[PDB]
């Protein structure tokens, strides 16, 4: 009971998502972002170059890097149980 699993798919500006992917509560947001930069699909008008260019949002909150999935949990964060969708926003700075 500190290292449990959850499935995330990532919603993109396009409307397309990528995932689902399995991660642990112990995974960092920082990690999650790297995974995003990596699996970024081809032929987008936008492509995140690095990790410093992607913001992740889950249940209305912008998730900060150095927090972990487990500490980005809210009581109502996954009513259904199943896959959690998170939103990726790519900001060239």
């Amino acid at each position: 009971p500190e290292e449990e699993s959850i499935d995330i798919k990532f919603r993109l500006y396009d409307g397309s998502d990528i995932g689902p992917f399995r991660y642990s509560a112990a995974s960092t947001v920082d990690f999650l972002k790297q995974r995003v930069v990596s699996d970024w699909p081809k032929g987008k008008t936008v492509v995140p170059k690095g990790i410093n260019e992607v913001k992740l949002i889950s249940s209305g909150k912008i998730l900060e890097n150095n927090k972990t999935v487990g500490q980005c949990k809210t009581p109502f964060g996954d009513i259904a149980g199943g896959v959690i969708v998170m939103h990726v926003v790519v900001q060239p700075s």
């Binding site: 919603r11 249940s59 209305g60 809210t74 109502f76 259904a80 926003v89 700075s93």
Partner: protein, 148 residues
């Protein structure tokens, strides 16, 4: 708790398939109190921005609309210094057919198409009607300062 049940339903549906341009859930354990983010649409000067919104569902939802304030600063005819929004479907066009998703999406449409003739901020409404290119320019800028 028709309200609770219906809010819960709206959460469930949202979490299954959220609108691509917005994210929302309950802040903590009060499920009448959500927070949300609007992603400024490509087809507006607020492109790239992420805007924070709070949401308070009234006790007799869905017969009355939710209360919705922006927390992030925006340059917009229909949103004022305190993040009050002038939005049709929170007023006379509320219907209990509508959902918080539908509301959140409307706010997107508002970013891409403001209504200067129903202003909450007359300098901006005037600038918009009078000198659109400058409105466009001005956030943009405020989108960079305050939403990035």
């Amino acid at each position: 708790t028709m309200a609770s049940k219906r809010i819960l339903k709206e959460l469930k549906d949202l979490q299954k398939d959220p609108p691509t341009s917005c994210s929302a859930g309950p802040v903590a354990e009060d499920m009448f109190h959500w927070q949300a983010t609007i992603m400024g649409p490509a087809e507006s000067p607020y492109s790239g921005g992420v805007f924070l919104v709070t949401i308070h569902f009234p006790p007799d939802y869905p017969f009355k609309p939710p209360k919705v304030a922006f927390r992030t600063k925006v340059f917009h005819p229909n949103i004022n210094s305190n993040g009050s929004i002038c939005l049709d479907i929170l007023k006379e066009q509320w219907s209990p057919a509508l959902t918080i998703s539908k509301v959140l999406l409307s706010i997107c449409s508002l970013l891409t198409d403001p209504n200067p003739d129903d202003p909450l901020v007359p300098e901006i409404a005037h600038m918009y009607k009078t000198d659109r290119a400058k409105y466009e320019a001005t956030a943009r800028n405020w989108t960079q300062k305050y939403a990035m």
